[PDB]
Amino acid sequence: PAIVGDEHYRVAQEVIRILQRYKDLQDIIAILGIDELSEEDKQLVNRARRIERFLSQNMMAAEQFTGQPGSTVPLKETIEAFDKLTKGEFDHLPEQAFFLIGGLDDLAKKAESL
Amino acid sequence: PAIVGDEHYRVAQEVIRILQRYKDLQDIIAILGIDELSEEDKQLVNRARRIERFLSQNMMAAEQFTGQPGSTVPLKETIEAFDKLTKGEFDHLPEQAFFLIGGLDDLAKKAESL
Amino acid sequence: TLRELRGRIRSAGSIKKITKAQELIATSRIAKAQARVEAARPYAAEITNMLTELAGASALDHPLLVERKQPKRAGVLVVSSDRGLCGAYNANVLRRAEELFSLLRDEGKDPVLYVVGRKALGYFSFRQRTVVESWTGFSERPTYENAREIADTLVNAFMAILGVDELHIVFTEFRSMLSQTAVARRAAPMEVEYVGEYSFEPDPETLFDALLPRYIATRVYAALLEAAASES
Amino acid sequence: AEREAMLAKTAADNRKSAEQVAAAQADYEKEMAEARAQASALRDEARAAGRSVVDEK
Amino acid sequence: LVSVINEFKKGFQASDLEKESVKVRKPAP
Amino acid sequence: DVFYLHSRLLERCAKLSDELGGGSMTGLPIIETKANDISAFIPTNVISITDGQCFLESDLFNQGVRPAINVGVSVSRVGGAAQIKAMKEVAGSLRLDLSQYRELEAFAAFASDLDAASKAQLDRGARLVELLKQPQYSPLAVEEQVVAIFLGTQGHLDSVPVEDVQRFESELLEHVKASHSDIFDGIRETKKLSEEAEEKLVSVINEFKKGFQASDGSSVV
Amino acid sequence: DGQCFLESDLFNQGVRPAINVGVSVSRVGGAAQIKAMKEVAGSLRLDLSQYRELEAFAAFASDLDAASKAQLDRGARLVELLKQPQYSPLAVEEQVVAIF
Amino acid sequence: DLNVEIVAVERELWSGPATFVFTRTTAGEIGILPRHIPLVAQLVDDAMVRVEREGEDDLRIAVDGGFLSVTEETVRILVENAQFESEIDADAAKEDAASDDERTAAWGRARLRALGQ
Amino acid sequence: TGIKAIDAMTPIGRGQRQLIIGDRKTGKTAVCVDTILNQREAWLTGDPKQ
Amino acid sequence: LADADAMHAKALADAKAESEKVTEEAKQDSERIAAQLSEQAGSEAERIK
Ligand SMILES: Nc1ncnc2c1ncn2[C@@H]1O[C@H](COP(=O)(O)OP(=O)(O)OP(=O)(O)O)[C@@H](O)[C@H]1O
Ligand SMILES: [Mg+2]
């Protein structure tokens, strides 16, 4: 909390908690199936899928392969975006919308493109 | 298989397979108990105990280790006996019947003595 | 020493895999057992409703509703699992059963065992306590036939043969997933529960008498289902 | 009486037909399976003869 | 020796609460 | 300098540029690990030096998984660049399938209680494991390997019993070579499994299935 | 020519004098016994080793066969028979009668 | 139309609407059509139930010692164990009908009666 | 190499350095002799590039 | 009933035809395998020579 802002630490810890809970539920999903989870578990699984896919990014190193310039997401924008993700504000967009996109502007544009 | 024949090779490799599975299961059996194994694995364990004890033999040089005289088992009889074991024809006999016998006739005699 | 440690680290890994598999299979079987518990709720509710109606129309002198004049023996149906790895499930059930036995002795009643599940048989045989009848091999997947047999034996003992003047059932109630509590219920004689406020064929006395054993059977079945869910 | 006869025999004929469709299916499948098993045995015997001839040569 | 063992074993002293209810649906008995 | 001793050696094994003729020298050093201790000094050194490792384990050998490469632990840093396109596309899902099978192996006794997808993965993995088994002194040409892995990854073995997979593959190739060599010739000459060749291969697999006698007496279709 | 591998674990269990039957062995064997002792105790060491192995195996089995249970009983009685307090030697005749 | 539901002790067995229900209670044979007065009765040990399903053909059920309840909302048949006519094994029912055990004989006879004898 | 496991899971491209590592009597010399044998089809082509 | 009898006879005839074709293909495959293995044996004998 000291070197980074308290908001940064809170958002990062929330993301870590969500991802850890999802990693725990992976065994149940793989063996018992998604439908054997509870509604709260399914909501968390959707949110964790979207979070972990939003952790991806269109790297500059990939510009040579696709052409899409790489994104340099400002730290504040990443913090607020993941605050929105962990609070469920983007749980209604398709998972493919979160792949390889830097920031909320790119998220919205890709969502509208799907 | 090109030297000892396909039958000998198959029986030897099946015996080794059963014994390796038994060695892998011995950790489970000592703690979780035999009752918690799969039915196939339980049958395999019963097979493997008898196979281990049947590999024991009353050798001539060990008369002063056991009192009883030594025995000689033809290779054909060994292959036949182990094919029967690995295939199940002796699962009904007690495992102690397979200890220090050396042959199928001795197996029958010791089983009757039990 | 290093060889021993690596062998132990192998065993522990195999045991971890087996126990994780068992945990996930138990998660599945909890869902199955809870679904069965819910599936039997309609019959229980409807039989209870018609039983209340008949009791309203009945005389309420059935043997299962009147305490014996001097209770000598009190049967106890201890519902335990038939396979291990169930944690303190059996331990909790049998601790509650022993507490019930102490309470019965404090009341002068001599407990007599009916035991469901192999583990309780071992527990009671080690302690030189005789089980009059025992049923095993269905605690994981109880059917209504097992409950019918258990209730029939219990009711026959109650009516009687040395017989028993009372009967309790100790089992692990499945209050919620996190929590399962060993509870003892007196399944006979049943208390008449008057509360603030139909036709019957044949007359409500015979119909009520033929229905009450069915009520005991369905309650024993619900107890077995809930014990299976708690075991899982 | 004949009314009865017809009803019952019609019953049994719809029975025969329902059982005979299954019987034709099962018999065709059994004959096909036997033919395929004999073909596999013939191929296996050919392979065994090939092994014997290669070994002897 | 076997006879001795058997005759000795002949004389050897071995050391060996909720309550189910029917709701009557009427207010008084 | 023992590390150097091995390094100085293994680094001769290189692929030369086109200016030097384009020749290459492939190294297959063999190391005996005592009690499967890959953390010993020489094993550590040569694992560091080399580009990849086929880890052979005696436990897998005794289970009958011979040639006994412990997939998963075994790695090749060159990766798909060292595979023809046919094998690259066919064997892409093989690694994930085997990993899932090793994860699911603890559930082999409860296949009734698993999800449909999980049970299908377990059944697929057992047959893939049987598929990777291979008799000694009998290497398979790349086209035959492509067809064999195609049988398993695409699900054509899902109907064959596990204990018969080794035979079903062995006969099927023996059939294809003798009668439908166009598939092998296409894979060899073009290095990829074309769509028309894939359809022909599927048709021949299905035709062979009808004439295949499972060791248990059942039919596979 | 042999071992008498005395085990602390066995010593604490009350198996005194602590011979781990499995590890212990005498390669002179029956040649160093009187014929009565040899005949009475010909397979005793191997029987006890098998008993120990089975006791480790049958630690938590609840469906032991009749032969297995008989083997455990015989082995436990033999183990009790081989217990012996310090400074209480037994003549060879008494030893053969005991193992008998 | 009647709301007819047949509830086995283990599970709910059938819930389709019907126009007429028919069964032999311990005190005689009875038929129920909508707006029947509330009733409670015990089906005979070897009883059978006919449910005149409005849409398709009637449903014949072998019932094991069930109870019958009629209510302003629904007609309930509580069942220890029941089988639809299509699920009955005719040979098994015939064999059981001769069984010495009272329960087994009654169940087999109920199966025969539901099947159509 | 001709071994389905190696050619599918851990492919060896010429110019690579692949280590066959394992305890005794596990199949290493077998793997390498199989690899050597598998090159006969390439040799019989007569093309130095193969 | 008449249709089922005719279709059963047709199915038996079709099974006979399928068995004939299958055994013909089996003889063809046996000849192919024998030729391949004899060629292999000849090649191995020539290599030994
Ligand atoms: N794929 C295989 N299928 C069947 N048997 C095999 C296979 N690979 C090896 N073997 C057998 O396993 C044994 C060990 O083979 P190999 O000689 O190649 O081992 P190695 O690992 O080189 O060991 P060593 O240290 O003895 O040289 C031999 O019997 C060989 O025939
Ligand atoms: Mg070698």
GROMACS .gro file of N, CA, C and O and ligand atoms in nm, chain F residues 30 32, chain I residues 23-30, ligand 2:
model
   41
  576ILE      N    1   2.308  -3.924  -2.472
  576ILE     CA    2   2.235  -4.015  -2.385
  576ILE      C    3   2.298  -4.007  -2.247
  576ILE      O    4   2.419  -4.023  -2.233
  578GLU      N    5   2.262  -4.144  -1.841
  578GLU     CA    6   2.207  -4.236  -1.743
  578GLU      C    7   2.192  -4.162  -1.611
  578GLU      O    8   2.292  -4.118  -1.553
 1007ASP      N    9   1.718  -4.339  -1.644
 1007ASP     CA   10   1.792  -4.440  -1.570
 1007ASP      C   11   1.823  -4.558  -1.660
 1007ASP      O   12   1.784  -4.564  -1.777
 1008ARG      N   13   1.897  -4.654  -1.605
 1008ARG     CA   14   1.943  -4.768  -1.683
 1008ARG      C   15   1.825  -4.853  -1.728
 1008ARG      O   16   1.722  -4.861  -1.662
 1009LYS      N   17   1.843  -4.918  -1.843
 1009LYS     CA   18   1.746  -5.012  -1.898
 1009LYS      C   19   1.607  -4.949  -1.907
 1009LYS      O   20   1.506  -5.009  -1.868
 1010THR      N   21   1.603  -4.827  -1.960
 1010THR     CA   22   1.478  -4.756  -1.978
 1010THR      C   23   1.441  -4.736  -2.124
 1010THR      O   24   1.328  -4.693  -2.152
 1011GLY      N   25   1.531  -4.763  -2.218
 1011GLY     CA   26   1.501  -4.755  -2.359
 1011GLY      C   27   1.576  -4.649  -2.436
 1011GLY      O   28   1.529  -4.608  -2.543
 1012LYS      N   29   1.691  -4.603  -2.387
 1012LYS     CA   30   1.761  -4.493  -2.451
 1012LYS      C   31   1.831  -4.539  -2.578
 1012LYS      O   32   1.805  -4.487  -2.688
 1013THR      N   33   1.923  -4.635  -2.565
 1013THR     CA   34   1.989  -4.688  -2.683
 1013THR      C   35   1.888  -4.736  -2.785
 1013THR      O   36   1.911  -4.728  -2.906
 1014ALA      N   37   1.774  -4.788  -2.739
 1014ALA     CA   38   1.669  -4.829  -2.830
 1014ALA      C   39   1.617  -4.710  -2.909
 1014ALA      O   40   1.599  -4.717  -3.031
 1085MG      MG   41   2.211  -4.820  -2.371
   0.00000   0.00000   0.00000
